[PDB]
């Protein structure tokens, strides 16, 4: 079975509640998932502080899909994903072949194609990162002052989301980490990488941006109209 | 201090809010008086159009000169410095701020900081902190590594240099080696000199694709 985990983080107002053509970013994102019947549940995890606001917002914009549930997020991105896993486990149990497609609420421009390919790659390979080829040259620095290296450009990618997993694999790898590894690891796919399992790449889109700044909001208002 | 604006219908003539990208870029350099010359290097076929475009948009600065570009980006940078050499000579402390014409959103701050860093350290890259997690891959299919997030930056332009240092570094390499390293700061790196960082802006994008042009019109509007 296939599940969606929508990560709706905190911060005056979290950016997923900003308006994009008179509809909050969160609603744009959710509408993309509602149109795929493959998902058994579509779970929005958000800090307690924003839970009622999330529920109210879904109602205001006539979201009525019976698969949507709003739950409390965790202490970091990965703890939030594991809260979603525990919610699925408590309500439906977990099957051998279950996959979860996790995705940032402030990325409203992912496509049907991206979601369906994430599901298929998660079933085939167990772990999936959505990335694009680096738009600008990647430059590395250990001191925030001088160049350390300029790596080979065709090997560099910028990560987006979704990030998708066989759920049992994600549980086993998260259990396989160190309290320090859990403690500093802020990427979900790094959980898999660091327990030395393969992570497949799904190519994103240049417009699959994260809306975090005013500049992003300007671009997002342009994207939403095309 | 010299400006070298690299101009490869070419994308720098595409309209951005009803004014070509090249003019947007040039206007930021014209408002910095430190520059002794502002040189636009572009292929022969585009020199008069370039000149005409500057006249059409009331660019009236005696420091602007349009010269013939080179066989690649690095050969064009060296065409610029050789033009500077033939016209004015080179002083010990001369710097050049090189910049892509299709990056119209650089700021006064960025240019001024590029000037200080070139005078202080000899070589400078304009970069921004990586907005997304950087992932590496050897097969274009599976992750190889996820490097440390705070060490990752995205390179933009300007890239600015003490001119004698750049002459010396380009002279000590192979032109085949030069072309396989087409980043100017990568060539300085490979000639064993340090490169200082100046922080750009998230909007200091290059306008190369139709999608980029849409984003650029969104930024400006």
PDB file of C-alpha atoms in Angstrom, chain B residues 27-210:
ATOM      1  CA  UNK B  27      23.192  49.604 -15.948  1.00  0.00           C
ATOM      2  CA  UNK B  28      24.526  48.110 -12.687  1.00  0.00           C
ATOM      3  CA  UNK B  29      28.142  48.525 -13.836  1.00  0.00           C
ATOM      4  CA  UNK B  30      27.612  52.033 -15.150  1.00  0.00           C
ATOM      5  CA  UNK B  31      26.581  53.155 -11.670  1.00  0.00           C
ATOM      6  CA  UNK B  32      29.958  52.067 -10.215  1.00  0.00           C
ATOM      7  CA  UNK B  33      32.400  54.886 -10.976  1.00  0.00           C
ATOM      8  CA  UNK B  34      35.514  52.928  -9.905  1.00  0.00           C
ATOM      9  CA  UNK B  35      35.727  51.343 -13.356  1.00  0.00           C
ATOM     10  CA  UNK B  36      38.253  52.845 -15.756  1.00  0.00           C
ATOM     11  CA  UNK B  37      36.723  50.918 -18.662  1.00  0.00           C
ATOM     12  CA  UNK B  38      33.656  48.714 -19.051  1.00  0.00           C
ATOM     13  CA  UNK B  39      34.408  46.295 -21.891  1.00  0.00           C
ATOM     14  CA  UNK B  40      31.754  44.142 -23.551  1.00  0.00           C
ATOM     15  CA  UNK B  41      33.382  41.295 -25.463  1.00  0.00           C
ATOM     16  CA  UNK B  42      31.128  39.606 -27.994  1.00  0.00           C
ATOM     17  CA  UNK B  43      31.475  37.743 -31.317  1.00  0.00           C
ATOM     18  CA  UNK B  44      32.193  39.949 -34.335  1.00  0.00           C
ATOM     19  CA  UNK B  45      28.717  39.390 -35.798  1.00  0.00           C
ATOM     20  CA  UNK B  46      27.134  41.007 -32.721  1.00  0.00           C
ATOM     21  CA  UNK B  47      29.338  44.049 -32.134  1.00  0.00           C
ATOM     22  CA  UNK B  48      27.334  46.651 -34.067  1.00  0.00           C
ATOM     23  CA  UNK B  49      24.025  45.291 -32.788  1.00  0.00           C
ATOM     24  CA  UNK B  50      25.520  45.571 -29.312  1.00  0.00           C
ATOM     25  CA  UNK B  51      26.603  49.148 -29.962  1.00  0.00           C
ATOM     26  CA  UNK B  52      23.244  49.961 -31.533  1.00  0.00           C
ATOM     27  CA  UNK B  53      21.374  48.462 -28.585  1.00  0.00           C
ATOM     28  CA  UNK B  54      23.336  50.597 -26.132  1.00  0.00           C
ATOM     29  CA  UNK B  55      22.512  53.676 -28.192  1.00  0.00           C
ATOM     30  CA  UNK B  56      18.839  52.705 -28.389  1.00  0.00           C
ATOM     31  CA  UNK B  57      18.615  52.562 -24.589  1.00  0.00           C
ATOM     32  CA  UNK B  58      20.411  55.865 -23.926  1.00  0.00           C
ATOM     33  CA  UNK B  59      23.579  54.221 -22.679  1.00  0.00           C
ATOM     34  CA  UNK B  60      25.929  57.183 -22.899  1.00  0.00           C
ATOM     35  CA  UNK B  61      29.160  56.346 -21.081  1.00  0.00           C
ATOM     36  CA  UNK B  62      32.576  56.987 -22.562  1.00  0.00           C
ATOM     37  CA  UNK B  63      34.029  54.107 -20.500  1.00  0.00           C
ATOM     38  CA  UNK B  64      32.052  51.496 -22.449  1.00  0.00           C
ATOM     39  CA  UNK B  65      33.849  49.748 -25.292  1.00  0.00           C
ATOM     40  CA  UNK B  66      32.660  46.811 -27.405  1.00  0.00           C
ATOM     41  CA  UNK B  67      35.418  44.419 -28.513  1.00  0.00           C
ATOM     42  CA  UNK B  68      35.624  41.141 -30.387  1.00  0.00           C
ATOM     43  CA  UNK B  69      35.261  38.066 -28.209  1.00  0.00           C
ATOM     44  CA  UNK B  70      37.301  34.901 -28.218  1.00  0.00           C
ATOM     45  CA  UNK B  71      37.030  31.215 -29.071  1.00  0.00           C
ATOM     46  CA  UNK B  72      35.539  30.271 -25.677  1.00  0.00           C
ATOM     47  CA  UNK B  73      34.795  31.984 -22.373  1.00  0.00           C
ATOM     48  CA  UNK B  74      38.428  31.917 -21.189  1.00  0.00           C
ATOM     49  CA  UNK B  75      39.839  33.066 -24.516  1.00  0.00           C
ATOM     50  CA  UNK B  76      37.285  35.889 -24.359  1.00  0.00           C
ATOM     51  CA  UNK B  77      38.424  36.912 -20.869  1.00  0.00           C
ATOM     52  CA  UNK B  78      41.946  36.966 -22.207  1.00  0.00           C
ATOM     53  CA  UNK B  79      40.846  38.997 -25.227  1.00  0.00           C
ATOM     54  CA  UNK B  80      39.523  41.553 -22.749  1.00  0.00           C
ATOM     55  CA  UNK B  81      42.772  41.728 -20.784  1.00  0.00           C
ATOM     56  CA  UNK B  82      44.843  41.896 -23.983  1.00  0.00           C
ATOM     57  CA  UNK B  83      42.653  44.800 -25.138  1.00  0.00           C
ATOM     58  CA  UNK B  84      43.231  46.509 -21.780  1.00  0.00           C
ATOM     59  CA  UNK B  85      46.952  45.795 -22.181  1.00  0.00           C
ATOM     60  CA  UNK B  86      47.145  47.304 -25.661  1.00  0.00           C
ATOM     61  CA  UNK B  87      45.145  50.399 -24.759  1.00  0.00           C
ATOM     62  CA  UNK B  88      46.112  51.347 -21.177  1.00  0.00           C
ATOM     63  CA  UNK B  89      48.801  48.931 -19.981  1.00  0.00           C
ATOM     64  CA  UNK B  90      48.575  47.031 -16.681  1.00  0.00           C
ATOM     65  CA  UNK B  91      49.528  48.285 -13.212  1.00  0.00           C
ATOM     66  CA  UNK B  92      50.634  46.126 -10.281  1.00  0.00           C
ATOM     67  CA  UNK B  93      47.293  46.599  -8.507  1.00  0.00           C
ATOM     68  CA  UNK B  94      44.936  46.477 -11.514  1.00  0.00           C
ATOM     69  CA  UNK B  95      41.809  44.304 -11.101  1.00  0.00           C
ATOM     70  CA  UNK B  96      39.160  43.027 -13.515  1.00  0.00           C
ATOM     71  CA  UNK B  97      35.587  42.194 -12.516  1.00  0.00           C
ATOM     72  CA  UNK B  98      34.365  39.592 -15.015  1.00  0.00           C
ATOM     73  CA  UNK B  99      30.648  38.961 -15.299  1.00  0.00           C
ATOM     74  CA  UNK B 100      28.140  37.207 -17.557  1.00  0.00           C
ATOM     75  CA  UNK B 101      25.838  39.554 -19.478  1.00  0.00           C
ATOM     76  CA  UNK B 102      22.978  37.106 -18.803  1.00  0.00           C
ATOM     77  CA  UNK B 103      23.203  37.757 -15.069  1.00  0.00           C
ATOM     78  CA  UNK B 104      21.279  41.065 -14.904  1.00  0.00           C
ATOM     79  CA  UNK B 105      20.336  40.967 -11.202  1.00  0.00           C
ATOM     80  CA  UNK B 106      23.734  41.436  -9.531  1.00  0.00           C
ATOM     81  CA  UNK B 107      23.840  44.250  -6.992  1.00  0.00           C
ATOM     82  CA  UNK B 108      25.922  47.323  -6.239  1.00  0.00           C
ATOM     83  CA  UNK B 109      27.014  45.544  -3.057  1.00  0.00           C
ATOM     84  CA  UNK B 110      28.159  42.478  -5.003  1.00  0.00           C
ATOM     85  CA  UNK B 111      30.304  44.563  -7.389  1.00  0.00           C
ATOM     86  CA  UNK B 112      31.838  46.711  -4.647  1.00  0.00           C
ATOM     87  CA  UNK B 113      32.675  43.638  -2.560  1.00  0.00           C
ATOM     88  CA  UNK B 114      34.170  41.975  -5.633  1.00  0.00           C
ATOM     89  CA  UNK B 115      36.425  45.014  -6.042  1.00  0.00           C
ATOM     90  CA  UNK B 116      37.628  44.894  -2.394  1.00  0.00           C
ATOM     91  CA  UNK B 117      38.246  41.144  -2.546  1.00  0.00           C
ATOM     92  CA  UNK B 118      40.231  41.351  -5.758  1.00  0.00           C
ATOM     93  CA  UNK B 119      42.425  44.126  -4.335  1.00  0.00           C
ATOM     94  CA  UNK B 120      42.910  42.261  -1.046  1.00  0.00           C
ATOM     95  CA  UNK B 121      43.302  38.637  -2.148  1.00  0.00           C
ATOM     96  CA  UNK B 122      43.860  38.643  -5.917  1.00  0.00           C
ATOM     97  CA  UNK B 123      40.982  36.291  -6.865  1.00  0.00           C
ATOM     98  CA  UNK B 124      37.308  36.083  -5.902  1.00  0.00           C
ATOM     99  CA  UNK B 125      34.233  33.993  -6.721  1.00  0.00           C
ATOM    100  CA  UNK B 126      30.680  35.216  -6.115  1.00  0.00           C
ATOM    101  CA  UNK B 127      28.708  32.327  -4.532  1.00  0.00           C
ATOM    102  CA  UNK B 128      25.550  31.682  -2.496  1.00  0.00           C
ATOM    103  CA  UNK B 129      24.962  29.176   0.276  1.00  0.00           C
ATOM    104  CA  UNK B 130      23.394  26.096  -1.278  1.00  0.00           C
ATOM    105  CA  UNK B 131      19.617  26.390  -0.844  1.00  0.00           C
ATOM    106  CA  UNK B 132      18.986  22.673  -1.293  1.00  0.00           C
ATOM    107  CA  UNK B 133      20.801  19.628  -0.057  1.00  0.00           C
ATOM    108  CA  UNK B 134      23.564  18.784  -2.533  1.00  0.00           C
ATOM    109  CA  UNK B 135      23.713  15.151  -3.660  1.00  0.00           C
ATOM    110  CA  UNK B 136      26.459  13.514  -5.713  1.00  0.00           C
ATOM    111  CA  UNK B 137      26.207  10.679  -8.238  1.00  0.00           C
ATOM    112  CA  UNK B 138      28.618   8.849 -10.542  1.00  0.00           C
ATOM    113  CA  UNK B 139      26.016   7.055 -12.701  1.00  0.00           C
ATOM    114  CA  UNK B 140      23.228   9.669 -12.966  1.00  0.00           C
ATOM    115  CA  UNK B 141      21.011   6.996 -11.285  1.00  0.00           C
ATOM    116  CA  UNK B 142      22.001   6.369  -7.614  1.00  0.00           C
ATOM    117  CA  UNK B 143      23.392   8.549  -4.834  1.00  0.00           C
ATOM    118  CA  UNK B 144      27.137   8.336  -4.248  1.00  0.00           C
ATOM    119  CA  UNK B 145      27.385  10.768  -1.329  1.00  0.00           C
ATOM    120  CA  UNK B 146      25.487  13.497   0.488  1.00  0.00           C
ATOM    121  CA  UNK B 147      28.252  15.963   1.485  1.00  0.00           C
ATOM    122  CA  UNK B 148      28.182  18.296   4.466  1.00  0.00           C
ATOM    123  CA  UNK B 149      25.468  20.865   3.831  1.00  0.00           C
ATOM    124  CA  UNK B 150      27.217  23.927   5.271  1.00  0.00           C
ATOM    125  CA  UNK B 151      30.220  23.374   2.962  1.00  0.00           C
ATOM    126  CA  UNK B 152      28.147  23.581  -0.272  1.00  0.00           C
ATOM    127  CA  UNK B 153      27.792  26.769  -2.351  1.00  0.00           C
ATOM    128  CA  UNK B 154      26.403  27.654  -5.779  1.00  0.00           C
ATOM    129  CA  UNK B 155      28.750  29.625  -8.019  1.00  0.00           C
ATOM    130  CA  UNK B 156      27.560  32.743  -9.785  1.00  0.00           C
ATOM    131  CA  UNK B 157      29.416  35.705 -11.246  1.00  0.00           C
ATOM    132  CA  UNK B 158      31.167  38.192 -11.003  1.00  0.00           C
ATOM    133  CA  UNK B 159      34.525  36.504 -10.720  1.00  0.00           C
ATOM    134  CA  UNK B 160      37.136  39.135 -10.079  1.00  0.00           C
ATOM    135  CA  UNK B 161      40.927  39.020 -10.254  1.00  0.00           C
ATOM    136  CA  UNK B 162      44.132  40.948  -9.926  1.00  0.00           C
ATOM    137  CA  UNK B 163      45.062  41.197 -13.587  1.00  0.00           C
ATOM    138  CA  UNK B 164      48.737  40.226 -13.241  1.00  0.00           C
ATOM    139  CA  UNK B 165      47.703  37.133 -11.239  1.00  0.00           C
ATOM    140  CA  UNK B 166      45.222  36.079 -13.943  1.00  0.00           C
ATOM    141  CA  UNK B 167      47.750  36.616 -16.737  1.00  0.00           C
ATOM    142  CA  UNK B 168      50.286  34.506 -14.819  1.00  0.00           C
ATOM    143  CA  UNK B 169      47.820  31.697 -14.081  1.00  0.00           C
ATOM    144  CA  UNK B 170      46.463  31.421 -17.626  1.00  0.00           C
ATOM    145  CA  UNK B 171      50.002  31.524 -19.036  1.00  0.00           C
ATOM    146  CA  UNK B 172      51.126  28.548 -16.936  1.00  0.00           C
ATOM    147  CA  UNK B 173      48.534  26.049 -18.246  1.00  0.00           C
ATOM    148  CA  UNK B 174      47.544  24.157 -21.375  1.00  0.00           C
ATOM    149  CA  UNK B 175      44.808  25.646 -23.581  1.00  0.00           C
ATOM    150  CA  UNK B 176      43.407  22.138 -23.660  1.00  0.00           C
ATOM    151  CA  UNK B 177      43.635  22.126 -19.875  1.00  0.00           C
ATOM    152  CA  UNK B 178      42.172  25.650 -19.952  1.00  0.00           C
ATOM    153  CA  UNK B 179      39.127  24.544 -21.980  1.00  0.00           C
ATOM    154  CA  UNK B 180      38.436  21.443 -19.886  1.00  0.00           C
ATOM    155  CA  UNK B 181      38.366  23.798 -16.853  1.00  0.00           C
ATOM    156  CA  UNK B 182      36.096  26.505 -18.258  1.00  0.00           C
ATOM    157  CA  UNK B 183      35.469  28.104 -14.892  1.00  0.00           C
ATOM    158  CA  UNK B 184      37.956  30.947 -14.480  1.00  0.00           C
ATOM    159  CA  UNK B 185      38.164  30.449 -10.724  1.00  0.00           C
ATOM    160  CA  UNK B 186      38.791  26.766 -11.332  1.00  0.00           C
ATOM    161  CA  UNK B 187      41.806  27.762 -13.427  1.00  0.00           C
ATOM    162  CA  UNK B 188      43.139  29.911 -10.598  1.00  0.00           C
ATOM    163  CA  UNK B 189      42.495  27.030  -8.175  1.00  0.00           C
ATOM    164  CA  UNK B 190      44.441  24.724 -10.460  1.00  0.00           C
ATOM    165  CA  UNK B 191      47.389  27.170 -10.551  1.00  0.00           C
ATOM    166  CA  UNK B 192      47.748  26.912  -6.724  1.00  0.00           C
ATOM    167  CA  UNK B 193      46.403  30.313  -5.597  1.00  0.00           C
ATOM    168  CA  UNK B 194      43.578  30.954  -3.083  1.00  0.00           C
ATOM    169  CA  UNK B 195      40.151  32.183  -4.212  1.00  0.00           C
ATOM    170  CA  UNK B 196      38.148  34.397  -1.830  1.00  0.00           C
ATOM    171  CA  UNK B 197      34.325  34.177  -1.550  1.00  0.00           C
ATOM    172  CA  UNK B 198      31.870  37.075  -1.893  1.00  0.00           C
ATOM    173  CA  UNK B 199      28.234  36.152  -1.226  1.00  0.00           C
ATOM    174  CA  UNK B 200      25.883  36.769  -4.147  1.00  0.00           C
ATOM    175  CA  UNK B 201      22.103  36.814  -3.987  1.00  0.00           C
ATOM    176  CA  UNK B 202      19.530  34.084  -4.550  1.00  0.00           C
ATOM    177  CA  UNK B 203      18.106  36.121  -7.453  1.00  0.00           C
ATOM    178  CA  UNK B 204      21.509  36.585  -9.161  1.00  0.00           C
ATOM    179  CA  UNK B 205      20.476  33.913 -11.682  1.00  0.00           C
ATOM    180  CA  UNK B 206      21.694  33.436 -15.236  1.00  0.00           C
ATOM    181  CA  UNK B 207      19.013  33.787 -17.924  1.00  0.00           C
ATOM    182  CA  UNK B 208      19.734  30.943 -20.366  1.00  0.00           C
ATOM    183  CA  UNK B 209      16.410  29.140 -20.992  1.00  0.00           C
ATOM    184  CA  UNK B 210      12.774  30.117 -21.623  1.00  0.00           C
TER     185      UNK B 210
END
